[PDB]
Scaffold this active site. Structure first.
Site, PDB file in Angstrom:
ATOM      1  N   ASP A   7       0.835  -1.219   0.000  1.00 43.22           N
ATOM      2  CA  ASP A   7       0.000   0.000   0.000  1.00 43.22           C
ATOM      3  C   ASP A   7       0.866   1.264   0.000  1.00 43.22           C
ATOM      4  OD1 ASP A   7      -2.396  -1.598   0.277  1.00 43.22           O
ATOM      5  OD2 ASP A   7      -2.006  -1.728   2.428  1.00 43.22           O
ATOM      6  N   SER A  32       2.033   6.819  -0.318  1.00 41.77           N
ATOM      7  CA  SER A  32       1.160   6.116   0.597  1.00 41.77           C
ATOM      8  C   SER A  32      -0.186   6.040  -0.110  1.00 41.77           C
ATOM      9  CB  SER A  32       1.031   6.876   1.911  1.00 41.77           C
ATOM     10  OG  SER A  32      -0.006   6.321   2.705  1.00 41.77           O
ATOM     11  N   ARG A  33      -0.720   4.831  -0.210  1.00 47.94           N
ATOM     12  CA  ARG A  33      -1.981   4.604  -0.890  1.00 47.94           C
ATOM     13  C   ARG A  33      -3.182   4.757   0.059  1.00 47.94           C
ATOM     14  NH1 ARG A  33      -0.563   0.738  -5.063  1.00 47.94           N
ATOM     15  NH2 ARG A  33       1.575   0.953  -5.906  1.00 47.94           N
ATOM     16  N   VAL A  34      -2.920   5.024   1.339  1.00 49.50           N
ATOM     17  CA  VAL A  34      -3.977   5.285   2.321  1.00 49.50           C
ATOM     18  C   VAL A  34      -4.139   6.790   2.581  1.00 49.50           C
ATOM     19  CG1 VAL A  34      -4.787   4.776   4.678  1.00 49.50           C
ATOM     20  CG2 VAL A  34      -3.663   3.006   3.314  1.00 49.50           C
TER      21      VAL A  34
END
Lengths: 85, 54, 75, 155, 260, 85, 153, 152
Positions: A7, A32-34
């Site tokens: 992620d 950061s994929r969050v």
């Protein structure tokens, strides 16, 4: 392979490490994929624009190395970028 | 390219000077023989004003 | 001649130019002289009598034995 | 894998890291995306010619980039640099705030109707906005928003 | 990776075509700069003739301030670079002469000059960034402003003189007060002195421009040769990696097949 | 394999295509070993000259994005080439 | 083989062919060589700071070298010209004559104490020898040998 | 593939469009083409010296291509200007009509004996024919054939 699983990634380059940026994180290439969903309200309130700002700063910094005359606006951005860095 | 750094530093710079000169137009507009005069008088004035924010 | 180029370069019978003190008509054999001129028209009698007038911003007129040379300002 | 996939498509949307890296989202490569319906007989010559005009000014910029990387912009002609300025505007006017992306941009998504897209891009290629600043074109919807952003940038 | 080397060769190859062309353009512009200088030379020679005559009969003491007062540094540089050490050499001469003499005021003509001098310690009273080979009209403006500062103590002018297309000699010339060649007399001397200073500045400009395009001629020449040298070394490394990729891809294919 | 088997090749390029050169044929690299023998007299009368004039234009096309102190001749090559293109 | 060896080491000295061809011996790549001991708590802050500073200027020089290859040095900013100058002096000051290489070099070998190394390199980084010529720094021991050589010229 | 092949080649013949587009047939590149046996101990000092001279003058001409392009031929020094005339004549004298091409040219082919070639060029290099027009050396056999073509 592994990047395509996780992620996000924290990418470290020897160039930055040796030029003094430690930890040697490359901000443009790390992700950061969050996102802000992983930050507290507090952190979000200060850090929302820091990535963009530092990206603009690196561009302008390379530009200023042409010695040319700089208006007050550019000089202040350079000043602020160097200190944030 | 090869000089990918100079490449970007240049584009970014001359884009800044473009935008900055649009801001200078907005300054001289905010200040406005005589039409011609003021347009010069406040071209130069607005350019100094912009290079001076506080 | 001006700062940029040669304005006149040929045979002339005479020139008429307005000097700082008054009018000047320079014929062949005129005695050596230096005078600043005022802005205005310079009359040139070329070769075989053909006249030509040109407005000059001023300058310096230098006369000697044969040749007369106008060092003209652009302003 | 991807190479054998191109042949099974009617429309290819190619995303580029080089473009993403610039903050341009969606990071679509305008000189590497295609559609089999991009034909004047299907979409009309208006749609076709504007799209084609957008691609032409961008390929011209791309060919120009190598030159300015050495000489800077000062060495270009008034026309050579007029394309540079529009090209960069057009590249910015291609970016768009996604509704799904609100968690990243902190801005409300936008949806632009087809007619409004064609019109808007047509005007920029025609030069009808050479006086507006680059930033006005970045992350907006229709060309009205560009004008309005420029206004909100004045003050 | 070959992906990067493909493009790196491409970039150097294209860039070499620009440096190659710019040599040819700089070569063309040096001709035209020398042509216009062949008019400025006799023009200034005639002014020098009249000036040497007036100074021969210039009453004493008391003369005029512009012929003898009783330091301002003017530095002529390009706006754009890519001209080798053209601007470096001239700015070194300015730095040197200032270090010897004063132990000032600077008039910066051209961006490269102002840039370098400001970063060091810009004692900069007036600056100029002149857009267009510009003509005599723009040398009058700088002559009048510099006279406007001498009126109300000494002005000196640094520029690159020609030797050859390869060599360009930085030098300094004193402009104010003026120095002797070694209806009234006083009235004509009152207008010729400011008008002579003006022409010297203009002469120095044209000389300095042709020196710039000589320096650029030989600078972009070197860049072209250096690009060809880099293109060879890059191609040799590209072909190593090309052959290695084929060799190694094959081994993998064949090693897997032999396990069955 | 196929390049060596054939009598000639028409090479296409993406750069040419998106610039507005369509068909996107690279006149510089493309070839027909049969060449002149496969075209009508009419075409033979002009084709060879057009091929040569565009060839001249392509080698100096670096001046199209510069120019300045050009002379009449090189200026005429640019004007015809842009048009034949 | 080598790539898997790094994982077994506490310090790595990477020799470079490009460096050796410049005449700089030992041919150690200052930016590809690492130590698990280079930590301010272990070597001290002065030692630590001077090393990071040397590597900083060398890396900056490295990033320029590409642009210098075509256009040359005259196109660098008046500031980068300065880092180049010190960097090139630092490149040579890292060079050193060995006792065991006398047989080929003809130069008596030298051993510089760590304390003398830090100081010497700090002074160069701070600019205290910007007036000394490059050649003065090449193939010597401590900084005192540099100055002495600068006198022989 | 070519690396293994080159281990066996004693010489090369490079045929180019550039030379073909100047009408010099055969379209052989006089500087790119080479031979191992171009050595005094093999082909003799006379052959070697003459060859090396032609190569140099063709090289010096190729070096002047730049100064001539952007400025003009009326800029080269008298020495250089002469080496341009001899060089261009040299380039023409390397041309040669072939028998095989009698059907397309209408002109008779020619077989120039080695000794004749070595000497002919030696005279051109020497400058013993600076009083003749370029076109006299274009598409002929021996040096004699140059002298003749001139008279007509």
């Amino acid at each position: 392979n592994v990047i395509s699983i996780t992620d996000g990634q924290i990418f470290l380059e020897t160039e930055l490490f040796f030029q003094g940026i430690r930890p040697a994180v490359n901000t443009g290439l790390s992700v950061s994929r969050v996102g802000s969903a992983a930050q507290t309200k507090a952190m979000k309130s200060v850090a929302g624009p820091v990535k963009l700002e530092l990206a603009q700063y690196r561009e302008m910094a390379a530009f200023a190395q042409f010695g040319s005359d700089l208006d007050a606006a550019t000089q202040k951005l350079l000043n602020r970028g160097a200190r944030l860095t | 390219t090869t000089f990918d750094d100079r490449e970007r530093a240049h584009e970014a710079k001359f884009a800044h000077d473009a935008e900055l000169n649009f801001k200078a137009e907005a300054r001289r507009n905010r200040l406005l023989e005589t039409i011609r005069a003021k347009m010069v008088e406040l071209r130069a004035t607005a350019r100094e004003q912009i290079i001076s924010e506080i | 001649v001006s700062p940029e180029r040669n304005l006149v370069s040929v045979p002339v019978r005479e020139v008429r130019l307005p000097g700082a003190d008054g009018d000047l008509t320079a014929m062949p054999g005129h005695a050596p002289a230096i005078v600043n001129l005022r802005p205005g028209l310079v009359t040139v009698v070329a070769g075989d009598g053909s006249e030509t007038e040109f407005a000059v911003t001023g300058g310096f007129a230098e006369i000697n034995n044969e040749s007369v040379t106008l060092l003209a300002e652009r302003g | 894998a991807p190479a054998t996939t191109f042949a099974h498509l009617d429309a290819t949307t190619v995303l580029s890291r080089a473009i993403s890296e610039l903050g341009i989202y969606p990071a679509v490569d305008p000189l590497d995306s295609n559609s089999r319906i991009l034909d004047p007989a299907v979409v009309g010559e208006e749609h076709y010619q504007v799209a084609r005009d957008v691609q032409g000014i961008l390929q011209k910029y791309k060919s120009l980039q190598d030159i300015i990387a050495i000489l800077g912009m000062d060495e270009l002609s008034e026309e050579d640099k007029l394309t540079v300025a529009r090209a960069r505007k057009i590249q910015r006017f291609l970016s768009q705030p996604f509704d799904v992306a609100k968690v990243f941009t902190g801005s409300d998504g936008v949806q632009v109707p087809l007619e409004d897209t064609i019109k808007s891009f047509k005007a920029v290629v025609a030069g009808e906005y050479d006086h507006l600043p680059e930033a006005a074109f970045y992350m907006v919807g229709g060309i009205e928003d560009v004008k309005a952003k420029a206004q909100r940038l004045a003050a | 990776s070959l992906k990067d080397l493909k493009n790196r060769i491409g970039s150097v190859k294209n860039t070499r075509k620009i440096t190659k062309a710019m040599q040819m353009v700089a070569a063309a512009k040096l001709r035209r700069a020398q042509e216009a200088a062949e008019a400025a030379r006799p023009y200034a020679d005639r002014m020098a003739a009249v000036m040497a005559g007036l100074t021969a009969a210039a009453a004493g003491m008391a003369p005029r301030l512009l012929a003898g007062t009783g330091h301002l540094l003017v530095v002529m540089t390009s706006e754009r670079g890519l001209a080798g050490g053209f601007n470096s050499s001239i700015v070194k001469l300015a730095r040197l002469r200032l270090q010897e003499l004063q132990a000032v005021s600077i008039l910066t003509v051209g961006k490269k000059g102002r840039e370098q001098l400001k970063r060091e310690y810009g004692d900069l009273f007036v600056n100029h960034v002149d857009l267009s080979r510009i003509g005599y009209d723009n040398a009058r403006a700088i002559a009048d402003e510099i006279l406007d500062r001498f009126d109300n103590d000494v002005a000196t002018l640094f520029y690159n003189r020609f030797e050859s297309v390869i060599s360009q000699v930085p030098t300094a010339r004193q402009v104010i007060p003026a120095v002797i060649e070694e209806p009234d007399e006083n009235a004509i001397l009152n207008d010729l002195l400011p008008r002579s200073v003006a022409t010297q500045v203009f002469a120095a400009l044209l000389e300095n421009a042709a020196s710039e395009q000589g320096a650029r001629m030989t600078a972009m020449d070197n860049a072209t040769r250096n690009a060809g040298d880099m293109i060879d070394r890059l191609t040799t490394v590209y072909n190593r990696s090309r052959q290695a990729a084929i060799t190694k891809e094959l081994i993998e294919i064949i090693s897997g097949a032999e396990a069955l």
